[PDB]
């Protein structure tokens, strides 16, 4: 507040739905183009999830929807 999108990481006990909401709000607050925000989400969202969730999300493979990610965790 203001936090860089680079610093948003899922806590060890943080539910994935809470982390995605925190990530979304932080990125909304960032002063950047839609292109930069898209690149940031593609690069950081799964990468900055906690190791337990990251194993689950990566197993879904590329192109998984947010709905599918929510129903996996």
């Amino acid at each position, epitope marked *: 507040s203001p936090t860089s999108i*680079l610093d948003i*990481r899922q806590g060890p006990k943080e539910p994935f739905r809470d982390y995605v909401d925190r990530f979304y709000k932080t990125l909304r607050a960032e002063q950047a183009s839609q292109e930069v925000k898209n690149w940031m989400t593609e690069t950081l969202l799964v990468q900055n999830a906690n190791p337990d969730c990251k194993t689950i999300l990566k197993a879904l493979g590329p192109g998984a929807t947010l709905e599918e990610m929510m129903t996996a965790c």
Partner: nanobody, 110 residues
Framework: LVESGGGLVQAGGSLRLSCAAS????????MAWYRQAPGKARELIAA????????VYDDSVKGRFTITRDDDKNILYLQMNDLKPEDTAMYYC??????WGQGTQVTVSS
């Protein structure tokens, strides 16, 4: 963390910013340059990711600025070409979990 390369230049001029940092900074997959002009919120203008070396730029810096990372020296760069008066601001480098630095001032006349 050492940020430098800023200074006073005329419109159409060039500068190369350097972000010399620790190994911990360079463990971050994503690194970015932020621009902050007086009385304005900071803007995410350029970013790079480790491995494939993919980059992204804000529309206001396309075809003028280039972000590069030297993993052998742990230095993040921002090559700024065809500088415009609107580029006048404090420039900051950022990585995941990194402490903000002092920034470096870029001032463009005309």
């Amino acid at each position: 963390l050492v940020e430098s390369g800023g200074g006073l230049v005329q419109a159409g001029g060039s500068l190369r910013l350097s972000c010399a940092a620790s190994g911990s900074f360079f463990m971050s997959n994503v690194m970015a340059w932020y621009r902050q002009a007086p009385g304005k919120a900071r803007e995410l203008i350029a970013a790079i990711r480790g491995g494939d070396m993919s980059t992204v730029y804000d529309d206001s810096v396309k075809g003028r600025f280039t972000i590069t990372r030297d993993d052998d020296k742990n230095i993040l760069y921002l090559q700024m070409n065809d500088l415009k008066p609107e580029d006048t601001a404090m420039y900051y480098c950022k990585a995941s979990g990194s402490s903000w630095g002092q920034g470096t001032q870029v001032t463009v006349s005309s």
